[model samples]
Target: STGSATTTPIDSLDDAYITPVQIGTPAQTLNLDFDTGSSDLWVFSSETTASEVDGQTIYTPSKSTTAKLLSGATWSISYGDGSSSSGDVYTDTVSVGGLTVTGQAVESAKKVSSSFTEDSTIDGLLGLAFSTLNTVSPTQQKTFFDNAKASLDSPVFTADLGYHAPGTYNFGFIDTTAYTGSITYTAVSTKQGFWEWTSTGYAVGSGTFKSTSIDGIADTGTTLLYLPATVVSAYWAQVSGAKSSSSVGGYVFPCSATLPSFTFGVGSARIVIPGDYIDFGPISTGSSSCFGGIQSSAGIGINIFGDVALKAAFVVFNGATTPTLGFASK
Candidate 1:
């Protein structure tokens, strides 16, 4: 069997992409941020403190007959942005895009950071990365993909994130029509608990493609592209009036400046991200200076290929025993 789902950007900035997920017996649906960067299916629920509850939807485990407390099980997770959530675990019948997984570990949030509480766009997150990253204490839990892989026609999934429009997430098999050319496959290392892989090199606009290898993670949870300071500086240098600002944070430039496209290589395939996508948007409302979509990842220790790069091409997260990543032009 296979499953397919729609993923829509929550806002104009493409800040995040969310997919609807059904949990428990009667199937209570809530929009969940499907993230490949982390492993933990957590949600805002009745267990969350009353004060922390804003406009976001909450999952009431008590309302579902299939919901069963996973006694002695607790989970917690913290993201790169510092936003976090922690709570107890519950085993329930969870469904995503019609793929049902019985006894799925559902983390019900007891506490959430201010950042999560303020943004009501997402009710939770459905982790797609390896299950080994699950933060369940004592005994770890499997991710939705891990639990559903055996039942799927094929052990694979694909991400087709769009610019401002809706995209699709297909489970089990790849859709050949979704991409233009043949997929270029590369090895993936889960050692760091992420879909980490290395790119052959990169090119700034029409410049020569550097042959240096870059190590990074294909993180869907992240909003912008983060690379080494040298690489990041090279791209921004091409734009006039561009400067790295500490106050506004990251690289900013005049909104009227003509930007260049960015290209990255996967084996022999090169994916080009249009200049308009790199211009990001104005720093502030009506501000003339715009923030860049690509920033320096020097401080973060590891480079990140976030939405800025992912939305430019079709991506395959192959879950075979010898896991791999497949990139193709679209």
Candidate 2:
């Protein structure tokens, strides 16, 4: 259930190439991850011993013409799945898409897991989502956008995630042409770091189910659309010849026949997720079933609708003017 996030085929030209932002006088470069769910810049370094720094990109202080390490400041992150990473604070220059920003705050990990330490594909992550999750203090730190805002032609920034063809992610400027027209936006709650909404249940084969009165969050950093157990079971019951298999972790129907179509309602906006998107890989264990994007977190008290639901339409987080989430179509 945790790993159900879908992987859309990516093209070389569509991939976003990002480098680490080093802090201090002469900034150094470290590869990092660009995450929207959280705000922070981190990278693996020589200090990490459990996982070798071989083949992975590192930001060296000695080589940096100008760099500074915050003596006592450190960082640690834990995901919903129980995975975590920890590191010290540092500042340097960061570059992305040929644009460079100086005096950027970054984290250098002393200890990292196999997933982050061993992966050479990405150097580190850059969080561009919201400022509420930033690790820096109010008076001292600056977010990636705060520093780069001066260089951008537009006051607003947008992210275009292409999961299909080029399978690339775009940043900096919002492409107005990407959407059908003026976008419909929803104000985001300041408390949680996710985009929240209420759904009126689902529909299949010309029949609509009773409104489940569900509230959940939308996350692009994750893949797979998670729903509650009750919602998942109810939807599967309507699918003809549907079967549950342990290998798939939930209800999955046989692929012998065309899967049924399902629709979800967010107020008046009704989104339809096709069966083909659910059958991405077409693997045997039931890749065709519409997944429940909601998961149970003991005390967290929230559910997530991952990228699977996001890919079906265009979404915009309007943090510049008002704290709102906008949905649109291509």
Candidate 3:
């Protein structure tokens, strides 16, 4: 069974914002950004004097009834977008839903940028993607999945993203009712934190991109699919028959037509992304054209299958039993 991870919005005393689930509980909520691009869980703290942290929920170790700090450890993380944060290490009892995990490693950022501080609604990110990139070691660190594995009713975790709203990121079991019964599973390449795979190719409706075979990574933290320029151009050529406009800072295609479908090949696993994802949002008011979900990421080393692609399948990151990823029917 493939494990599923999710991205959702959390509401704290400050405001509501989107974040991945590290582990959340009624007693002490620990929602983090499960970034595949980086490994670290750094949250704002009351100790942070940086103006960027203003208006963001800061997790106070002093406020938590139960908190433990990792001795002599310092942490820092930088993203591909040139954003960064740094802090000290701490461990504490964290809960998600009804499950509780003790001694979970957490980093409290001493400093953060205004971009992250103002735009990000949650207190911090919980790195669950992989440990190779982890600033903290696996032996000393335990992610939400690592701690909750034994107590879960099933070996599966499912994430459901809401439509323009905060979705549910569930742990421990799969709700078959939530998805179609067909899921394509892929094997990990035995690499460290990077979850890499190859795509045999893709097709949109009856149209196919014959010249394109690609290697890529799926990331829940990212909002859009980052494809190569040539591939994006080719995809747009086929979907161009539909009206197009720019929305969400990207091309928006009308939903009037039956958008093309895409097939991603990962070893024996073949996954399909339906047309609706291609026709993302309604056209901008002044533009008269809708938006298309696919975007160009030319020069980027990899094609990132963001949330749009993930929503099409049941993806599981097995940090609990092994450093592996699996996909099964939702």
Candidate 4:
């Protein structure tokens, strides 16, 4: 059976999606971000100092009879956005949707940075990336999806993220009703523990699509789209009063900037990102300047097809040996 789950958006629009999962005995429920960028299932727990956490639900291993401590095991992880966590390990029964896995390596954070402690809504992260990317002391850990795949009907998951609405995450089966049109498949290179793929080209506004192969990762955890600095600068150049503002972000334009449609190629399909989505609302203040949804991934070493791009199309994460990506417009 397909294990279907629902995700709620943290903001009124696309910032992040949160899903519910059950951990340990008596079912301690937690709302987690199903991240495709990282490979660790970490949560703020009783181990985290009280002052460090606010408005967050903590997991207590002692309260669950199924929880077992991994001797001498510890974990420390950092993200590109400067969020970090360090803690011990506990193997417990972790269940998502209708699928259950025993001995799932769950990281219980003893210390968390301001990036995490400040965001109280995201209880934890459920990583869907390769198990090889898991960071744990002494030995790497296996993710919940990896452990349960053997028992799943197809060992696959589909992400139908919405625009300013709720979405579905289905394991082992793709819901026929979630997306329309034929799905286009693109081969992915998972060598870096990411769904890395190269796009044949991209288009800005009504301009012709160019053949510039962009190597990037399809990351659901990331909120906005990221590409090369040159590509980003070129796109914003087409907009009036647009400039690269490091103080605010990659690029900011006047609120009245009539943005063009952004399209990225995947095999024979072209996914169009609406102009409204390109201007990511106002930057920080009530000012008339707004941040561009697309950012420069220059120093980050790799481009990322974050939520801004993913939400524009229906995505399928095929877990086959080759690990290809399927995309379609809703």
Top lDDT prediction, candidate number: 1
Predicted candidate 4 versus true structure: per-residue lDDT over 1-330, tens digit per residue: 458888888886578999999999989999999999999999989999788898888899999999999988999889999888889999999888888889999999999999788787889899988888899979889887788777878878888888888888889887778788888989888899998888888999888988889999999999999999878977998999999887875788999888898999998689999988776778766989988898899888889999899889888888887898889988
Ranking by TM-score: 1, 4, 3, 2
Q: Tell me the lDDT of model 3 at 297.
A: 68
Tens-digit lDDT string for candidate 1 (4-123):
999999998898999999999798999999999999999999999889879888999999999999999999899988899999999999988888999999999999999889879999
TM-score, per-candidate, Cα-based: 0.98, 0.74, 0.77, 0.97
Per-residue accuracy of model 3 over 192-265 as CA lDDT, tens digit each: 35666656666555664454467677676665677877677667776645432333545556445567777555
Writing each residue's lDDT as its tens digit, candidate 2 over 139-212 gives 34556765776666544444445544422233355567777755666556657654566666666546765566
RMSD of 3: 5.1
Candidate 4 stretches with Cα past 4 Å from truth are: none
Candidate 2: segments with Cα more than 4 A from true spot: 1-32, 50-55, 98-100, 118-120, 135-142, 146-155, 167-172, 198-213, 238-262, 280-300
Clashing pairs in 1: none
Q: Comparing 3 and 4 by lDDT, which wins?
A: 4
C-alpha positional error of residue 35 in candidate 4 after TM-score superposition, expressed in Å: 0.8
Judge candidate 1 at residue 221 and give its lDDT.
87
